[PDB]
Amino acid sequence: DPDELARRAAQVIADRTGIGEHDVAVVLGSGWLPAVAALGSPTTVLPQAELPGFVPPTAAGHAGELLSVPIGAHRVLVLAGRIHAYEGHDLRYVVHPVRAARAAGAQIMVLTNAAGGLRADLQVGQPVLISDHLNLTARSPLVGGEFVDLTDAYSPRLRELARQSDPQLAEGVYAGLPGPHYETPAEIRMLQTLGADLVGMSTVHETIAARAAGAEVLGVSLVTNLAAGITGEPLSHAEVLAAGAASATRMGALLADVIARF
Amino acid sequence: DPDELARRAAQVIADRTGIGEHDVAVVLGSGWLPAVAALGSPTTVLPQAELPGFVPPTAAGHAGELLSVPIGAHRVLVLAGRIHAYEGHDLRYVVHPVRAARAAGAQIMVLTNAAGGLRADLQVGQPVLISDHLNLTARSPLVGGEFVDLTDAYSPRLRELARQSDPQLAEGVYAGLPGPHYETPAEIRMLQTLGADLVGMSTVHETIAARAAGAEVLGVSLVTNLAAGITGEPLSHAEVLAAGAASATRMGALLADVIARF
Amino acid sequence: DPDELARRAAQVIADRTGIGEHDVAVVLGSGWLPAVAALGSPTTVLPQAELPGFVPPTAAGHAGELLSVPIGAHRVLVLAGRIHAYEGHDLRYVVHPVRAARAAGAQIMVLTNAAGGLRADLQVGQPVLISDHLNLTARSPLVGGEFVDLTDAYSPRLRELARQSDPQLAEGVYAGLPGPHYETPAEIRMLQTLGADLVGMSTVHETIAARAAGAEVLGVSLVTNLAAGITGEPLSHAEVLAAGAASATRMGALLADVIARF
Ligand SMILES: O=c1[nH]cnc2c(Sc3ccc(Br)cc3/C=C/P(=O)(O)O)c[nH]c12
Ligand SMILES: O=c1[nH]cnc2c(Sc3ccc(Br)cc3/C=C/P(=O)(O)O)c[nH]c12
Ligand SMILES: O=c1[nH]cnc2c(Sc3ccc(Br)cc3/C=C/P(=O)(O)O)c[nH]c12
């Protein structure tokens, strides 16, 4: 039962953090993990693997940390590490962190991800607010007749507040793909035709699960590379894996300023 | 084996109905089920639960009935309550009623559904004939080298006959998506680019099964809402259900009149 | 571990062919099997069934044979028949042959398929070079964080070599669908907009697995039919077979001539 696992998780978070309510939660992608220190000083740090439902029975142990960070007036639940669909787990395990955070009081979910830019005007190292998504995974985290509206899934309100922090923040449509292979240049030309500005391998299921629970979502991509076929050179996975470190302080500063305005 | 289970269902169906052969079958969508009464009144009701292959043995009280109804010269199997792909069961369960109906003698399947309207001419409460479909589920109900042609899958002949009942009927391409979440606005703009006029969460697998089994198909959508981002307004799931209820009489009367013409 | 089973298949291929290393591998799909004779005189032939990890190919014509063929300065591993995703197999089994080929030395993978032509200038019986692919299966054969760049997935070098053998050879973008149903005319019109020239039900996962394992790929489609709705008539799936036989000694001699140039 996702609801039951989510409440058992929230209880242990409340115990281990001695805080009964975290009103904001941030999921950090690979691209945003470097920024963790620049968010603020945490009051508690525990292994995600010690939390009910975080470690998919499939196998392995989540390599990720949960952090409790005071930012402005807010008490922030920071999830440093996420599970991806491309690891082969049921989506229940992929969106569990979002549901656990909701059951722990989260009103707002900041979902960060790495992405390829598809739009001429995007640069490597640029943070881009997510205006909307294309779920191209042919899956949903919802089972049975759980009908949810995905109008304004990325709160226009939270994007206004983000732009009060930095009026030059660009907006884009994020295409969520299964991965883990990068796209062919032909797949990228297809995604351009379908209205995509950004391409990644996360987020869309977390957004659906967050909206189904009634939480507000802010989505932020880090453009870690231009998308396949755009440069005329191949994608370097080394340049991509290292992209977050080139932007850590700038990204951490941005998240901390924007969360303070919620 | 699906085909085996469909033949045994058809044997039980002929025994329990006293009817050796049902020449037509209707799958009632969510937005059509309330129109069961205006089709005619049945000679037999059957609990799906008591029929070979209909209900996964571990299932929630989905209820579901198979009715035997006379309409003009026709003995019509009416499926009241279908298994959607978003319940998460094998597609063999989703298409079993079409295969069972075929084995029972149905050479015409009337496939009904609820749909979001993408085309500017379409309004809430409008029945629309299906001219063709986009299968955006990345699935097929067919396994191995069952290779089947979907040219004229929605019989032009049957759309002709429908239009003798109501000559004003529009027609449109239906996109079947997994669901159960509704589309983001950006997903709808994508489906417009791809050539969809209607969007729903069923029908496409049933059509493929029907054509593979050698039955003609008439598809009918009730437009229960404008698709996401067609207005500036979010989708209401309650107004989608209201449109179902509100269209009941007109939709049952339409099907009844169309089926007498076959 | 797919990689252990691939190694162990390569050791058994080596011991039963008495050939330590094959530098080139050819996957012959549906309607290429006729061309196997004209590739050259095999040194050895084995049943694919005798090899660890190989599922018996069950499709039309598919022999389940392995042939060790000398062609120019190359020792060619010819897989006469493949496993399709539409048979319901985990992709680890679909791409196992490509991985085994690679563990036995394959530097180059020649992947052939049947395809429908979406450009009406293409002729039944025409071989078309694959320039790029659209993976429309919503799947990957890679599991966990296996990040692979698919820029130049279909080696430009190898297509230039093929055009040296036959300068008239067309190239096109292959849309890989799940199958096994053929597409609606609406779906074909959708695939044109997504930038596809060819449509089939194989190859894309084999290509990803080959690039993942460090092999170069040449893709060659045989146009067996014009795609649904391109001509007003339906598709004939006994005339899809007739293209395969008509294109035997032509195809087989083209492949032998192209590999000699590698
Ligand atoms: O061009 C692109 N295509 C498709 N996807 C991408 C990503 S997404 C990514 C790339 C590398 C690592 Br490691 C992890 C992830 C997921 C990250 P997450 O932040 O969403 O968890 C970045 N660039 C592209
Ligand atoms: O905008 C839209 N997007 C996607 N799907 C839809 C449907 S489909 C539906 C809506 C409510 C209930 Br309850 C069930 C279903 C499935 C119904 P079925 O009729 O095919 O069985 C109506 N409108 C939309
Ligand atoms: O118009 C078309 N649409 C989609 N696909 C095709 C194929 S290819 C094919 C069609 C049906 C079955 Br069943 C199997 C295969 C693949 C065999 P392969 O091993 O060569 O890939 C030929 N024409 C079309």
PDB file of N, CA and C in Angstrom, chain A residues 96-171:
ATOM      1  N   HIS A  96       7.574   6.992  -4.254  1.00  0.00           N
ATOM      2  CA  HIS A  96       7.496   6.824  -2.774  1.00  0.00           C
ATOM      3  C   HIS A  96       8.124   8.009  -2.035  1.00  0.00           C
ATOM      4  N   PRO A  97       9.347   8.464  -2.398  1.00  0.00           N
ATOM      5  CA  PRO A  97       9.946   9.624  -1.750  1.00  0.00           C
ATOM      6  C   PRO A  97       9.026  10.845  -1.739  1.00  0.00           C
ATOM      7  N   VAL A  98       8.357  11.126  -2.862  1.00  0.00           N
ATOM      8  CA  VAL A  98       7.392  12.265  -2.981  1.00  0.00           C
ATOM      9  C   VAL A  98       6.203  12.053  -2.028  1.00  0.00           C
ATOM     10  N   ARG A  99       5.630  10.857  -1.992  1.00  0.00           N
ATOM     11  CA  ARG A  99       4.485  10.508  -1.119  1.00  0.00           C
ATOM     12  C   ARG A  99       4.906  10.538   0.364  1.00  0.00           C
ATOM     13  N   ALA A 100       6.082   9.989   0.694  1.00  0.00           N
ATOM     14  CA  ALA A 100       6.669  10.017   2.052  1.00  0.00           C
ATOM     15  C   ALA A 100       6.783  11.475   2.507  1.00  0.00           C
ATOM     16  N   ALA A 101       7.304  12.342   1.643  1.00  0.00           N
ATOM     17  CA  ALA A 101       7.521  13.773   1.941  1.00  0.00           C
ATOM     18  C   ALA A 101       6.171  14.452   2.187  1.00  0.00           C
ATOM     19  N   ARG A 102       5.162  14.135   1.384  1.00  0.00           N
ATOM     20  CA  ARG A 102       3.780  14.670   1.536  1.00  0.00           C
ATOM     21  C   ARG A 102       3.216  14.279   2.913  1.00  0.00           C
ATOM     22  N   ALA A 103       3.291  12.992   3.240  1.00  0.00           N
ATOM     23  CA  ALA A 103       2.832  12.446   4.535  1.00  0.00           C
ATOM     24  C   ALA A 103       3.636  13.084   5.677  1.00  0.00           C
ATOM     25  N   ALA A 104       4.787  13.696   5.399  1.00  0.00           N
ATOM     26  CA  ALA A 104       5.602  14.335   6.450  1.00  0.00           C
ATOM     27  C   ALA A 104       5.310  15.831   6.496  1.00  0.00           C
ATOM     28  N   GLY A 105       4.301  16.296   5.746  1.00  0.00           N
ATOM     29  CA  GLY A 105       3.795  17.675   5.803  1.00  0.00           C
ATOM     30  C   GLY A 105       4.108  18.505   4.568  1.00  0.00           C
ATOM     31  N   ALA A 106       4.817  17.961   3.579  1.00  0.00           N
ATOM     32  CA  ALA A 106       5.273  18.722   2.383  1.00  0.00           C
ATOM     33  C   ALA A 106       4.082  19.311   1.609  1.00  0.00           C
ATOM     34  N   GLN A 107       4.020  20.646   1.520  1.00  0.00           N
ATOM     35  CA  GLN A 107       2.992  21.424   0.767  1.00  0.00           C
ATOM     36  C   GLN A 107       3.468  21.672  -0.666  1.00  0.00           C
ATOM     37  N   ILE A 108       4.782  21.716  -0.838  1.00  0.00           N
ATOM     38  CA  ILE A 108       5.450  22.100  -2.113  1.00  0.00           C
ATOM     39  C   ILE A 108       6.586  21.104  -2.347  1.00  0.00           C
ATOM     40  N   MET A 109       6.695  20.586  -3.567  1.00  0.00           N
ATOM     41  CA  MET A 109       7.779  19.668  -3.992  1.00  0.00           C
ATOM     42  C   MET A 109       8.598  20.412  -5.039  1.00  0.00           C
ATOM     43  N   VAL A 110       9.876  20.569  -4.770  1.00  0.00           N
ATOM     44  CA  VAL A 110      10.854  21.102  -5.738  1.00  0.00           C
ATOM     45  C   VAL A 110      11.494  19.846  -6.326  1.00  0.00           C
ATOM     46  N   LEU A 111      11.186  19.588  -7.592  1.00  0.00           N
ATOM     47  CA  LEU A 111      11.744  18.445  -8.351  1.00  0.00           C
ATOM     48  C   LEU A 111      12.776  19.007  -9.316  1.00  0.00           C
ATOM     49  N   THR A 112      14.034  18.632  -9.084  1.00  0.00           N
ATOM     50  CA  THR A 112      15.196  19.012  -9.917  1.00  0.00           C
ATOM     51  C   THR A 112      15.609  17.801 -10.747  1.00  0.00           C
ATOM     52  N   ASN A 113      16.240  18.063 -11.875  1.00  0.00           N
ATOM     53  CA  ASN A 113      16.687  16.992 -12.787  1.00  0.00           C
ATOM     54  C   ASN A 113      17.776  17.598 -13.659  1.00  0.00           C
ATOM     55  N   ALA A 114      18.590  16.721 -14.220  1.00  0.00           N
ATOM     56  CA  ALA A 114      19.471  17.038 -15.356  1.00  0.00           C
ATOM     57  C   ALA A 114      18.615  16.949 -16.620  1.00  0.00           C
ATOM     58  N   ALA A 115      18.980  17.690 -17.666  1.00  0.00           N
ATOM     59  CA  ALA A 115      18.302  17.616 -18.977  1.00  0.00           C
ATOM     60  C   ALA A 115      19.218  18.071 -20.119  1.00  0.00           C
ATOM     61  N   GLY A 116      19.020  17.482 -21.298  1.00  0.00           N
ATOM     62  CA  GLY A 116      19.482  18.067 -22.566  1.00  0.00           C
ATOM     63  C   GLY A 116      18.582  19.225 -22.973  1.00  0.00           C
ATOM     64  N   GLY A 117      19.184  20.315 -23.446  1.00  0.00           N
ATOM     65  CA  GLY A 117      18.455  21.427 -24.086  1.00  0.00           C
ATOM     66  C   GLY A 117      18.166  21.120 -25.541  1.00  0.00           C
ATOM     67  N   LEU A 118      16.936  21.392 -25.993  1.00  0.00           N
ATOM     68  CA  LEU A 118      16.479  21.171 -27.387  1.00  0.00           C
ATOM     69  C   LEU A 118      16.295  22.501 -28.123  1.00  0.00           C
ATOM     70  N   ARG A 119      16.382  23.611 -27.400  1.00  0.00           N
ATOM     71  CA  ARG A 119      16.003  24.970 -27.859  1.00  0.00           C
ATOM     72  C   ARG A 119      17.319  25.731 -28.046  1.00  0.00           C
ATOM     73  N   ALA A 120      17.481  26.332 -29.224  1.00  0.00           N
ATOM     74  CA  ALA A 120      18.654  27.108 -29.685  1.00  0.00           C
ATOM     75  C   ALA A 120      19.195  28.007 -28.568  1.00  0.00           C
ATOM     76  N   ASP A 121      18.319  28.544 -27.708  1.00  0.00           N
ATOM     77  CA  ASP A 121      18.628  29.642 -26.754  1.00  0.00           C
ATOM     78  C   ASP A 121      19.043  29.084 -25.389  1.00  0.00           C
ATOM     79  N   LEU A 122      19.112  27.765 -25.218  1.00  0.00           N
ATOM     80  CA  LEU A 122      19.528  27.166 -23.924  1.00  0.00           C
ATOM     81  C   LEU A 122      21.037  26.943 -23.954  1.00  0.00           C
ATOM     82  N   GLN A 123      21.693  27.039 -22.800  1.00  0.00           N
ATOM     83  CA  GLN A 123      23.159  26.851 -22.666  1.00  0.00           C
ATOM     84  C   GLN A 123      23.434  25.778 -21.624  1.00  0.00           C
ATOM     85  N   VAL A 124      24.591  25.157 -21.734  1.00  0.00           N
ATOM     86  CA  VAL A 124      25.058  24.206 -20.699  1.00  0.00           C
ATOM     87  C   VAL A 124      25.298  25.046 -19.450  1.00  0.00           C
ATOM     88  N   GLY A 125      24.836  24.550 -18.298  1.00  0.00           N
ATOM     89  CA  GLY A 125      24.949  25.236 -17.005  1.00  0.00           C
ATOM     90  C   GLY A 125      23.743  26.105 -16.694  1.00  0.00           C
ATOM     91  N   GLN A 126      22.767  26.216 -17.598  1.00  0.00           N
ATOM     92  CA  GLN A 126      21.575  27.087 -17.398  1.00  0.00           C
ATOM     93  C   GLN A 126      20.460  26.322 -16.655  1.00  0.00           C
ATOM     94  N   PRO A 127      19.939  26.879 -15.531  1.00  0.00           N
ATOM     95  CA  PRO A 127      18.732  26.369 -14.890  1.00  0.00           C
ATOM     96  C   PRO A 127      17.519  26.895 -15.661  1.00  0.00           C
ATOM     97  N   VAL A 128      16.540  26.024 -15.856  1.00  0.00           N
ATOM     98  CA  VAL A 128      15.323  26.294 -16.664  1.00  0.00           C
ATOM     99  C   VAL A 128      14.148  25.812 -15.831  1.00  0.00           C
ATOM    100  N   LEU A 129      13.159  26.681 -15.618  1.00  0.00           N
ATOM    101  CA  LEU A 129      11.928  26.312 -14.899  1.00  0.00           C
ATOM    102  C   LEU A 129      11.158  25.432 -15.862  1.00  0.00           C
ATOM    103  N   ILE A 130      10.503  24.401 -15.332  1.00  0.00           N
ATOM    104  CA  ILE A 130       9.616  23.510 -16.131  1.00  0.00           C
ATOM    105  C   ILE A 130       8.210  24.126 -16.150  1.00  0.00           C
ATOM    106  N   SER A 131       7.692  24.421 -17.338  1.00  0.00           N
ATOM    107  CA  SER A 131       6.376  25.069 -17.549  1.00  0.00           C
ATOM    108  C   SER A 131       5.352  23.951 -17.671  1.00  0.00           C
ATOM    109  N   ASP A 132       5.772  22.825 -18.250  1.00  0.00           N
ATOM    110  CA  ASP A 132       4.907  21.650 -18.485  1.00  0.00           C
ATOM    111  C   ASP A 132       5.779  20.453 -18.845  1.00  0.00           C
ATOM    112  N   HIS A 133       5.165  19.274 -18.897  1.00  0.00           N
ATOM    113  CA  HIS A 133       5.853  18.024 -19.295  1.00  0.00           C
ATOM    114  C   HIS A 133       5.095  17.264 -20.396  1.00  0.00           C
ATOM    115  N   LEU A 134       5.868  16.431 -21.098  1.00  0.00           N
ATOM    116  CA  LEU A 134       5.450  15.341 -22.012  1.00  0.00           C
ATOM    117  C   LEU A 134       5.902  14.049 -21.346  1.00  0.00           C
ATOM    118  N   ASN A 135       4.954  13.287 -20.828  1.00  0.00           N
ATOM    119  CA  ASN A 135       5.213  11.922 -20.328  1.00  0.00           C
ATOM    120  C   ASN A 135       5.258  10.997 -21.548  1.00  0.00           C
ATOM    121  N   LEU A 136       6.456  10.613 -21.981  1.00  0.00           N
ATOM    122  CA  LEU A 136       6.638   9.733 -23.164  1.00  0.00           C
ATOM    123  C   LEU A 136       7.134   8.356 -22.698  1.00  0.00           C
ATOM    124  N   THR A 137       6.762   7.923 -21.488  1.00  0.00           N
ATOM    125  CA  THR A 137       7.200   6.645 -20.875  1.00  0.00           C
ATOM    126  C   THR A 137       6.119   5.567 -21.057  1.00  0.00           C
ATOM    127  N   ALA A 138       4.906   5.974 -21.451  1.00  0.00           N
ATOM    128  CA  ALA A 138       3.714   5.108 -21.622  1.00  0.00           C
ATOM    129  C   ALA A 138       3.334   4.459 -20.285  1.00  0.00           C
ATOM    130  N   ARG A 139       3.677   5.104 -19.176  1.00  0.00           N
ATOM    131  CA  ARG A 139       3.361   4.601 -17.819  1.00  0.00           C
ATOM    132  C   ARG A 139       2.771   5.735 -16.990  1.00  0.00           C
ATOM    133  N   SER A 140       2.168   5.358 -15.870  1.00  0.00           N
ATOM    134  CA  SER A 140       1.621   6.250 -14.819  1.00  0.00           C
ATOM    135  C   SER A 140       2.002   5.678 -13.460  1.00  0.00           C
ATOM    136  N   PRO A 141       2.307   6.496 -12.441  1.00  0.00           N
ATOM    137  CA  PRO A 141       2.428   5.980 -11.074  1.00  0.00           C
ATOM    138  C   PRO A 141       1.081   5.647 -10.405  1.00  0.00           C
ATOM    139  N   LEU A 142      -0.027   6.013 -11.043  1.00  0.00           N
ATOM    140  CA  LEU A 142      -1.388   5.769 -10.507  1.00  0.00           C
ATOM    141  C   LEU A 142      -1.907   4.445 -11.077  1.00  0.00           C
ATOM    142  N   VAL A 143      -2.592   3.656 -10.253  1.00  0.00           N
ATOM    143  CA  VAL A 143      -3.176   2.344 -10.659  1.00  0.00           C
ATOM    144  C   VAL A 143      -4.677   2.397 -10.381  1.00  0.00           C
ATOM    145  N   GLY A 144      -5.488   1.650 -11.134  1.00  0.00           N
ATOM    146  CA  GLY A 144      -6.961   1.724 -11.019  1.00  0.00           C
ATOM    147  C   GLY A 144      -7.458   3.122 -11.342  1.00  0.00           C
ATOM    148  N   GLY A 145      -8.764   3.364 -11.202  1.00  0.00           N
ATOM    149  CA  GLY A 145      -9.424   4.606 -11.650  1.00  0.00           C
ATOM    150  C   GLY A 145      -9.039   5.815 -10.811  1.00  0.00           C
ATOM    151  N   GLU A 146      -7.761   6.194 -10.799  1.00  0.00           N
ATOM    152  CA  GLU A 146      -7.265   7.342  -9.994  1.00  0.00           C
ATOM    153  C   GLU A 146      -7.056   8.540 -10.937  1.00  0.00           C
ATOM    154  N   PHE A 147      -8.134   9.237 -11.291  1.00  0.00           N
ATOM    155  CA  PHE A 147      -8.159  10.275 -12.351  1.00  0.00           C
ATOM    156  C   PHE A 147      -7.621  11.568 -11.727  1.00  0.00           C
ATOM    157  N   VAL A 148      -6.595  12.168 -12.331  1.00  0.00           N
ATOM    158  CA  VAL A 148      -5.946  13.405 -11.812  1.00  0.00           C
ATOM    159  C   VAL A 148      -5.792  14.400 -12.957  1.00  0.00           C
ATOM    160  N   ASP A 149      -6.100  15.668 -12.714  1.00  0.00           N
ATOM    161  CA  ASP A 149      -5.907  16.741 -13.720  1.00  0.00           C
ATOM    162  C   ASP A 149      -4.482  17.265 -13.633  1.00  0.00           C
ATOM    163  N   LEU A 150      -3.838  17.382 -14.782  1.00  0.00           N
ATOM    164  CA  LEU A 150      -2.428  17.816 -14.869  1.00  0.00           C
ATOM    165  C   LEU A 150      -2.368  19.185 -15.539  1.00  0.00           C
ATOM    166  N   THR A 151      -3.467  19.935 -15.515  1.00  0.00           N
ATOM    167  CA  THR A 151      -3.430  21.384 -15.816  1.00  0.00           C
ATOM    168  C   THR A 151      -2.647  22.057 -14.699  1.00  0.00           C
ATOM    169  N   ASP A 152      -1.735  22.950 -15.062  1.00  0.00           N
ATOM    170  CA  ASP A 152      -0.922  23.716 -14.092  1.00  0.00           C
ATOM    171  C   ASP A 152      -0.235  22.741 -13.122  1.00  0.00           C
ATOM    172  N   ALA A 153       0.238  21.590 -13.594  1.00  0.00           N
ATOM    173  CA  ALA A 153       0.996  20.630 -12.758  1.00  0.00           C
ATOM    174  C   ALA A 153       2.212  21.355 -12.167  1.00  0.00           C
ATOM    175  N   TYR A 154       2.854  22.225 -12.950  1.00  0.00           N
ATOM    176  CA  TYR A 154       3.991  23.079 -12.509  1.00  0.00           C
ATOM    177  C   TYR A 154       3.381  24.431 -12.142  1.00  0.00           C
ATOM    178  N   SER A 155       3.062  24.626 -10.860  1.00  0.00           N
ATOM    179  CA  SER A 155       2.339  25.818 -10.353  1.00  0.00           C
ATOM    180  C   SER A 155       2.874  27.071 -11.040  1.00  0.00           C
ATOM    181  N   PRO A 156       2.039  27.810 -11.815  1.00  0.00           N
ATOM    182  CA  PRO A 156       2.430  29.130 -12.321  1.00  0.00           C
ATOM    183  C   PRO A 156       2.813  30.085 -11.172  1.00  0.00           C
ATOM    184  N   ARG A 157       2.197  29.909 -10.000  1.00  0.00           N
ATOM    185  CA  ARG A 157       2.472  30.715  -8.786  1.00  0.00           C
ATOM    186  C   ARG A 157       3.948  30.572  -8.403  1.00  0.00           C
ATOM    187  N   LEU A 158       4.458  29.342  -8.292  1.00  0.00           N
ATOM    188  CA  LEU A 158       5.821  29.073  -7.768  1.00  0.00           C
ATOM    189  C   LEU A 158       6.839  29.552  -8.810  1.00  0.00           C
ATOM    190  N   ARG A 159       6.444  29.618 -10.073  1.00  0.00           N
ATOM    191  CA  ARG A 159       7.311  30.099 -11.182  1.00  0.00           C
ATOM    192  C   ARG A 159       7.412  31.640 -11.138  1.00  0.00           C
ATOM    193  N   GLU A 160       6.319  32.333 -10.810  1.00  0.00           N
ATOM    194  CA  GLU A 160       6.327  33.783 -10.490  1.00  0.00           C
ATOM    195  C   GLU A 160       7.338  34.033  -9.364  1.00  0.00           C
ATOM    196  N   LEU A 161       7.308  33.263  -8.277  1.00  0.00           N
ATOM    197  CA  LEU A 161       8.182  33.495  -7.093  1.00  0.00           C
ATOM    198  C   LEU A 161       9.646  33.260  -7.457  1.00  0.00           C
ATOM    199  N   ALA A 162       9.917  32.174  -8.177  1.00  0.00           N
ATOM    200  CA  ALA A 162      11.228  31.863  -8.787  1.00  0.00           C
ATOM    201  C   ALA A 162      11.745  33.080  -9.573  1.00  0.00           C
ATOM    202  N   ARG A 163      10.892  33.702 -10.395  1.00  0.00           N
ATOM    203  CA  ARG A 163      11.267  34.852 -11.269  1.00  0.00           C
ATOM    204  C   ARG A 163      11.361  36.139 -10.432  1.00  0.00           C
ATOM    205  N   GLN A 164      10.785  36.172  -9.231  1.00  0.00           N
ATOM    206  CA  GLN A 164      11.061  37.268  -8.254  1.00  0.00           C
ATOM    207  C   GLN A 164      12.498  37.108  -7.738  1.00  0.00           C
ATOM    208  N   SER A 165      12.973  35.873  -7.628  1.00  0.00           N
ATOM    209  CA  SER A 165      14.377  35.556  -7.257  1.00  0.00           C
ATOM    210  C   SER A 165      15.323  35.907  -8.414  1.00  0.00           C
ATOM    211  N   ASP A 166      14.938  35.636  -9.667  1.00  0.00           N
ATOM    212  CA  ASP A 166      15.797  35.862 -10.867  1.00  0.00           C
ATOM    213  C   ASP A 166      14.915  36.072 -12.090  1.00  0.00           C
ATOM    214  N   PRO A 167      14.692  37.334 -12.502  1.00  0.00           N
ATOM    215  CA  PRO A 167      13.684  37.612 -13.517  1.00  0.00           C
ATOM    216  C   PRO A 167      14.076  37.034 -14.884  1.00  0.00           C
ATOM    217  N   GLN A 168      15.320  36.576 -15.043  1.00  0.00           N
ATOM    218  CA  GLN A 168      15.845  36.082 -16.349  1.00  0.00           C
ATOM    219  C   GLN A 168      15.700  34.558 -16.449  1.00  0.00           C
ATOM    220  N   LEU A 169      15.242  33.878 -15.402  1.00  0.00           N
ATOM    221  CA  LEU A 169      14.982  32.419 -15.478  1.00  0.00           C
ATOM    222  C   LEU A 169      14.072  32.112 -16.664  1.00  0.00           C
ATOM    223  N   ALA A 170      14.560  31.287 -17.592  1.00  0.00           N
ATOM    224  CA  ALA A 170      13.795  30.792 -18.758  1.00  0.00           C
ATOM    225  C   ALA A 170      12.868  29.638 -18.343  1.00  0.00           C
ATOM    226  N   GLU A 171      11.824  29.415 -19.138  1.00  0.00           N
ATOM    227  CA  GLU A 171      10.814  28.338 -18.953  1.00  0.00           C
ATOM    228  C   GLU A 171      10.916  27.356 -20.113  1.00  0.00           C
TER     229      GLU A 171
END
